[PDB]
Design an enzyme around this catalytic site. Structure first.
Site, PDB file in Angstrom:
ATOM      1  N   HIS A   1       0.816  -1.216   0.000  1.00  6.78           N
ATOM      2  CA  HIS A   1       0.000   0.000   0.000  1.00  6.78           C
ATOM      3  C   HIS A   1       0.856   1.276   0.000  1.00  6.78           C
ATOM      4  CE1 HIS A   1      -2.553   3.247   1.471  1.00  6.78           C
ATOM      5  NE2 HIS A   1      -3.623   2.536   1.153  1.00  6.78           N
TER       6      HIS A   1
ATOM      7  N   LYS B   1       2.956   5.986  -7.487  1.00  6.15           N
ATOM      8  CA  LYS B   1       1.993   6.735  -8.288  1.00  6.15           C
ATOM      9  C   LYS B   1       2.398   8.199  -8.328  1.00  6.15           C
ATOM     10  CE  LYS B   1      -1.851   5.336  -6.244  1.00  6.15           C
ATOM     11  NZ  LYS B   1      -3.317   5.227  -5.964  1.00  6.15           N
TER      12      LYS B   1
END
Ligand SMILES: O=S(=O)(c1ccc(O)cc1O)N1Cc2ccc(O)cc2C1
Ligand SMILES: O=S(=O)(c1ccc(O)cc1O)N1Cc2ccc(O)cc2C1
Lengths: 363, 363
Positions: free
Chosen positions: A232, A239
């Site tokens: 995560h 990103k």
């Protein structure tokens, strides 16, 4: 046949949550006698953790508390607490108690599935209804860090119980990988972020990984950790690093790679992600961890995952060049202890803020 | 013929210090009419800054205040305030007033020359006399950051006045270089740190500098700044980076270089110093800025210099590998505004702490 929720909330909020170490989670077995133990532990511990955070919800500004989405989340917590109260007088020796308990935990996890974005809607409702103010905003920031970390810890306990007592990796203990290959998780997160970056920009930076295993330079770096949490955090960082890289290089066909270093020291296992995405001024860094400006809780929540086992996630940029992000984890399972907010005078006082001129000069 | 010091302290502490921008300092001229203006400004502003910080000294724990070295520093501040009070009724039109005032400022600067290590002796006296406690320690930390920053600001005002109105670089405005070549200061700090490193270890890492001038890639990076402050921060960082590098490479004849990047963005001018000195665990980073653990105020004081014109100095390590240190400065003289502590309810409240269990769980 249950007492009113407030009686239970008051009772259980008197206790402090009991933080467990990664080593303790790991050392927990899968027998019926282990299941009974898990049951008798969780029917006390989960109510303690639910009650503690529910008491803090009540300290939020009236403006925030009055929002329908905050009230909705509160009602979920109340029902989950009550669900567990049904088990207070049940016999652990009865296998039906154990199976029903597991079902109840699954029902709770599902009920709370949308907690993060529901709370975010609450923050938006507060802003739309009243306009935001800095005092409330500081309270919200303080509270949400604690609320979301509390939630992470509750989900951990529930996942551990349901996974162990009810299989892709039989070597895992619940959600814990005792031999998590850090670089493999890095690559998995990169692969997934690359799919997204390629979709929108038709290109993405390459990945370069370097490991520094200080004490054993040859050995691949492994640790005891919950891979989904590490994934995560890394996915969110990739990103951002990819988007910065592509957008700051609109004219280029050659993209600078994202460089990751995984370092293993005596106490820390640190993961640095370096991009040449042009960076951001220091002034704007704090905002990246702000729930208010983010109202995209990706970064603050990733940092909470890091903090949950006594780690951290830090960003350092060089405006005009790029940004380094570092995940700090504990190298040792014995040092990896849950970080849990607790409801006490200290926490209570921290909410007791108000409007005034700060201790530093304005021109 | 002067009133008792407390009457003056109470009067002047009512005012807030008035922060000046680098641009304002720079835009100040050298004429007699400019000198009169400097005089009439400083005979109000210096007492305001002296009084404000003196009021905070009084908020220190009795234990710290009772130490002879803290009492000594207090007495210096009292005398310096009184020295300036002698000028309240003096005529700026009289050149003798101006010359006497400059002399008085020189006398004050000299009087306060040893303030930093004298206060450190006070902290040591407190620890030796009473033993340290965490409540007092937090107060000391909060206070010293503000006290030392206040001192930096007072020294700035005095140096500006004495330099301008009483010469290696005629292009400088007081202590300000309107065209400070950042890499030149980097090299000067490196050269001096190298002398020290060579003395003790008979070797030192090389220096590599890279500039990233985002908007004008060819142009050498310059800024408006006080070179002595920049030098101070870089010298301290080099000393640490060199020591780490040599000590972590006891067996090597080849030392990894210290790498410096100077980046110029739209808002930040950032200077990163990267070493491969083996790093330090995250747990130990905070301590580097601690006056208590440092009782060597090099790092905390360097960070205050950075903060003084709205910048910062941050450290990020990778245990087992090395450490990055970043000085963040404002790129624009208009954004470079003094950061001054102020005595008000907010500051006062911040001292109002006490012993209790924190808002986070211990096992
Ligand atoms: O803040 S960044 O430095 C940054 C933040 C977090 C992170 O993990 C990495 C980063 O490079 N970066 C984001 C971004 C996204 C789009 C864009 O055009 C430019 C930038 C800069
Ligand atoms: O803390 S460090 O990482 C560090 C701190 C501040 C800094 O500016 C650079 C650094 O490398 N470093 C100091 C030092 C000094 C001696 C030694 O043997 C090892 C180390 C490590």
């Amino acid at each position: 046949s249950l007492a009113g929720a407030p009686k239970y909330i008051e009772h259980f909020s008197k206790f402090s949550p009991s933080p467990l170490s990664m080593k303790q989670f790991l050392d927990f077995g899968s027998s019926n006698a282990c299941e009974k133990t898990s049951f008798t532990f969780l029917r006390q511990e989960l109510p303690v953790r639910l009650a503690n955070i529910m008491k803090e919800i009540n300290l939020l500004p009236d403006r925030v508390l009055s929002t329908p989405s905050v009230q909705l989340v509160q009602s979920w917590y109340v029902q989950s607490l009550l669900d567990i109260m049904e088990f207070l007088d049940k016999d652990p020796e009865d296998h039906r108690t154990l199976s029903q308990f597991t079902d109840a935990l699954v029902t709770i996890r599902n009920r709370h599935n949308d907690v993060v974005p529901t709370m975010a809607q609450g923050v938006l409702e507060y802003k739309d209804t009243y306009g935001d103010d800095p005092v409330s905003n500081q309270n919200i920031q303080y509270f949400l860090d604690r609320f979301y970390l509390s939630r992470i810890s509750i989900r951990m306990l529930i996942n551990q119980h349901t996974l162990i007592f009810d299989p892709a990796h039989p070597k895992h203990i619940g959600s814990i990988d005792p031999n998590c290959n850090v670089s493999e998780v890095v690559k998995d997160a990169y692969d997934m972020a690359k799919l997204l970056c390629d979709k929108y920009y038709m290109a993405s930076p390459d990945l370069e990984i370097q490991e520094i295993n200080a004490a054993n330079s040859k050995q691949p770096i492994h640790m005891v950790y919950v891979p989904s949490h590490l994934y995560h955090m890394l996915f969110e960082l990739f990103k951002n690093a990819m988007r910065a890289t592509v957008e700051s290089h609109e004219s280029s066909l050659i993209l600078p790679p994202i460089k990751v270093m995984v370092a293993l020291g005596e106490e820390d296992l640190s993961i640095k992600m370096s991009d040449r995405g042009g960076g951001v001024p220091l002034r704007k860094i704090e905002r990246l961890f702000s729930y208010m400006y983010s109202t995209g809780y990706g970064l603050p929540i990733s940092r909470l995952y890091a903090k949950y086992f006594q780690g951290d996630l830090q960003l350092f940029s060089m405006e005009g060049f790029g940004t380094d992000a570092v995940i700090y984890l504990k190298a040792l399972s014995t040092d990896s202890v849950e970080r849990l907010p607790v409801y006490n005078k200290s926490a209570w006082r921290h909410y007791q803020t108000i409007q005034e001129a700060g201790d530093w000069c304005v021109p």
